Design a protein around this ligand. Sequence first.
Ligand SMILES: OC[C@H]1C[C@H](O)[C@@H](O)[C@@H](O[C@H]2O[C@H](CO)[C@@H](O)[C@H](O)[C@H]2O)[C@@H]1O
Length: 349
Amino acid sequence: NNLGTELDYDTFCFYYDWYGSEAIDGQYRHWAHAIAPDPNGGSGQNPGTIPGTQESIASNFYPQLGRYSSSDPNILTKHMDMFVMARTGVLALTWWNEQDETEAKRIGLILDAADKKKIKVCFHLEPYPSRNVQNLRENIVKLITRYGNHPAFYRKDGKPLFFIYDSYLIEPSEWEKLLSPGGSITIRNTAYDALMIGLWTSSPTVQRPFILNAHFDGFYTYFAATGFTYGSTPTNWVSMQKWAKENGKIFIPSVGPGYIDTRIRPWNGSVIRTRTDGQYYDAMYRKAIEAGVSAISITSFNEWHEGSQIEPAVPYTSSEFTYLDYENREPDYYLTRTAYWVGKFRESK
Ligand SMILES: OC[C@H]1C[C@H](O)[C@@H](O)[C@@H](O[C@H]2O[C@H](CO)[C@@H](O)[C@H](O)[C@H]2O)[C@@H]1O
């Protein structure tokens, strides 16, 4: 078929599976959330907590699906239909190495639901406690072993793909051991080889040698807020792509529809980026496409705390908070606008 509706498997949407309900999880997990103290605001702050009641959730927006559980199979079905509407073929699943049966169950449910709609799943490896290249290897082995034969497990030209958040926290000399073909604990040429996509944060003077010396296959930028880092400043993307091409690296810029996290970080207002009825998203997605990249990542499907979500949101005013909403646009606007951009990306490939 040539309908302009098919999934794109070089489009990765960052997905969070940490939401709970009292009924399913024992707690409205993540809808309830601690409020972060101001890191520049002195001692003895008692910032408090958002209780995750119907009226007061840990987001500046309000989900169309309500305070949902990430383990609810019926929610997962709806999310996969949303991925189909957005044409986003890869669900890039946040992975915190919880080592608990509830995590394992949820990952299986997500893979199962994804496969029903031909969506693929890859893992976004977060900075879990004591993360290092040895336990990372062990975890990559575990994930490929447990999930690699699941029909929804993502591969690109035969290789799994992992995004590594905060990869800069680990020295290139450690990364080399895992990611150079000669490394002491290499994954190259093994059953556990993968495309490893590191998080490019700061200036080229720092990031170029890091990426090369660490033997990453590519890099992404994550932040939905333009200008938050060098990497998340879209006017740098043409030059970042030129360098990537010259050095055999895969650049996967991250685009998002906006940013606001002031319910959980009231002091962080400088990072707010207004949605302007979709115009912010359009501008950022256009820059990614114009850079001539082979793959794009979307921050985010459902990081509700950071207000970067494309998942449908609805107007809501409670006694406790007046939520933001998609304003003049309908709740599914960011899904259908993502589909539009996936089309213009495919037209460019
Ligand atoms: O996925 C990468 C990164 C993206 C966002 O900054 C957060 O999801 C962050 O997690 C931390 O901040 C969350 C609040 O937004 C908090 O709920 C988590 O517990 C933190 O680990 C992700 O690492």
